[PDB]
Amino acid sequence: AMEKVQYLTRSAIRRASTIEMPQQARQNLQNLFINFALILIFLLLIAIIVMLL
């Protein structure tokens, strides 16, 4: 049967059907912390280069 297909689906739904501790809560907080920080630093960096070009 299409187990590999239902595999991604089970993992896509895992958050509500087979998730560990708050996997996406802890990952969404980490991603935002790392994405927000890198986006903020890249913005402050690109902004500084504008005045230091």
Curated annotation (Swiss-Prot):
Heart. CDD domains: Phospholamban (cd20250). A lipid is attached at residue 37 (S-palmitoyl cysteine). This is Phospholamban. It comes from the Eukaryota. InterPro entries: PLB (IPR005984). Pfam families: Phospholamban. One of its GO terms (molecular function) is enzyme inhibitor activity. It is a single-pass membrane protein. It is found in: Endoplasmic reticulum membrane; Sarcoplasmic reticulum membrane; Mitochondrion membrane; Membrane. Reversibly inhibits the activity of ATP2A2/SERCA2 in cardiac sarcoplasmic reticulum by decreasing the apparent affinity of the ATPase for Ca(2+). Binds preferentially to the ATP-bound E1 conformational form of ATP2A2 which predominates at low Ca(2+) concentrations during the diastolic phase of the cardiac cycle. Inhibits ATP2A2 Ca(2+) affinity by disrupting its allosteric activation by ATP. Modulates the contractility of the heart muscle in response to physiological stimuli via its effects on ATP2A2. GO terms for cellular component: calcium ion-transporting ATPase complex; endoplasmic reticulum; endoplasmic reticulum membrane; mitochondrial membrane; perinuclear region of cytoplasm; phospholamban complex; sarcoplasmic reticulum membrane. The modification N-acetylmethionine is found at residue 2. The modification Phosphoserine is found at residue 17. It comes from Oryctolagus cuniculus (Rabbit). The gene is PLN. GO terms for biological process: acrosome assembly; adenylate cyclase-activating adrenergic receptor signaling pathway involved in heart process; cardiac muscle tissue development; circadian sleep/wake cycle, sleep; intracellular calcium ion homeostasis; locomotor rhythm; muscle cell cellular homeostasis; negative regulation of ATPase-coupled calcium transmembrane transporter activity. PANTHER family: CARDIAC PHOSPHOLAMBAN. Homopentamer. Can also form heterooligomers with other sarcoplasmic/endoplasmic reticulum calcium ATPase (SERCA) regulators ARLN, ERLN, SLN and STRIT1/DWORF. Monomer. Interacts with HAX1. Interacts as a monomer with ATP2A2; the interaction decreases ATP2A2 Ca(2+) affinity. Interacts with VMP1; VMP1 competes with PLN and SLN to prevent them from forming an inhibitory complex with ATP2A2. Interacts with S100A1 in a Ca(2+)-dependent manner. Residues 2-32 are cytoplasmic.
